[PDB]
Amino acid sequence: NRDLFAELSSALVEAKQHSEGKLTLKTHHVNDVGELNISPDEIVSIREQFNMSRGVFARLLHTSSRTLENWEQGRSVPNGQAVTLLKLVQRHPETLSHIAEL
């Protein structure tokens, strides 16, 4: 009831026509994040919206207060997973509780 060659043929003439701009096909545009970036100001604001000191918040991120402060003043750049967690708790505040009870 279903034949391969016919399908590939139909799909390839379809594809040809879409490349010519003579046809419209359902299309998914996808771009991947190359890298995430976060400013010191953003880190401060994130920490502040939870009403937390550098120490507590840094404990939650399993890093030293000194390190967090270094991110916040720009003397250091947090690593990839760090930025990921920070962005994560920025968008989804629920996750900081998850981290806490982990």
């Binding site: 060659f5 399908e7 590939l8 390839l12 003439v13 379809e14 879409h18 096909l25």
Partner: protein, 102 residues
């Protein structure tokens, strides 16, 4: 950035093989490695990729210039007819006749 274009055939049969989650995943995988499916010899650039989870699934696609994936058809690991040599010849004929015009 890359683009996924679906043929009407693929669009029709996609839901019954790939769920939206494993489909999104499939797109990600294919985005990291566009050549992941190996070329079928004598088809003039047609690629075939197997996707696992139960039974596996088979996606036929064609990788175009400017990083756009033409997704032709999709069906189960219980495989349809492996193409007759004549059919492969006709396919490569269409592919070359497409390529020469550029």
């Amino acid at each position: 950035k890359s683009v996924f274009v679906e043929s009407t055939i693929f669009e029709k049969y996609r839901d019954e093989y790939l769920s939206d989650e494993e489909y999104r995943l499939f797109q990600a995988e294919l985005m990291l490695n566009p050549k992941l499916g190996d070329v079928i010899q004598g088809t003039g650039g047609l690629r075939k990729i197997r996707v696992a989870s139960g039974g596996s699934r088979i996606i036929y696609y064609f990788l175009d210039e400017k990083r756009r994936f033409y997704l032709l058809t999709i069906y189960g690991k219980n495989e349809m007819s492996d193409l007759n040599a004549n059919q492969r010849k006709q396919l490569m004929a269409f592919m070359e006749a497409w390529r020469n015009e550029q």
